């Protein structure tokens, strides 16, 4: 029986372990450590697709693409501050046009 199952997750609980050793972030790795991680990583993955999935239904597409991800990420308070120095590769820009740039008073 596998350490993913053992913990309930989907994100490779053994594979994140290695990368906590090969990285040399500290010397010794715990037991909760690599588990507790593959939980976060997964959750987030999960978070950002319940968004970029709906993104996709809104414009009648049905396969997620980078651009959907930009709407997702960008239309969302926290993710946005988590990804303030990130750059979504071909993920346009949230539609937006400033006020004083609109033509009126005939």
């Amino acid at each position: 029986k596998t350490r993913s199952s053992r913990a309930g997750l989907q994100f490779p609980v053994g594979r994140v372990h290695r990368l906590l050793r090969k990285g040399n972030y500290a010397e010794r790795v715990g037991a909760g450590a690599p588990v507790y991680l593959a939980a976060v990583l997964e959750y987030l993955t999960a978070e950002i697709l319940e968004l970029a999935g709906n993104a996709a239904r809104d414009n009648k597409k049905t396969r997620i693409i980078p651009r959907h991800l930009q709407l997702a990420v960008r239309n969302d308070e926290e993710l946005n501050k988590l990804l303030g120095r990130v750059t979504i590769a071909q993920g346009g820009v949230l539609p937006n046009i400033q006020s004083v740039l609109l033509p009126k008073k005939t």
């Binding site: 989907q10 950002i48 999935g53 996709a56 049905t62 693409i65 980078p66 959907h68 590769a89």
Partner: peptide, 24 residues
């Protein structure tokens, strides 16, 4: 693969591109 697996949970009937993915 761990993405796609955690995808189908959120949306059973939504795909994802390479680039869509390759980002994730």
């Amino acid at each position: 693969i761990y993405v796609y697996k955690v995808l189908k949970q959120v949306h059973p009937d939504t795909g994802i591109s390479s680039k869509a993915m390759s980002i994730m």
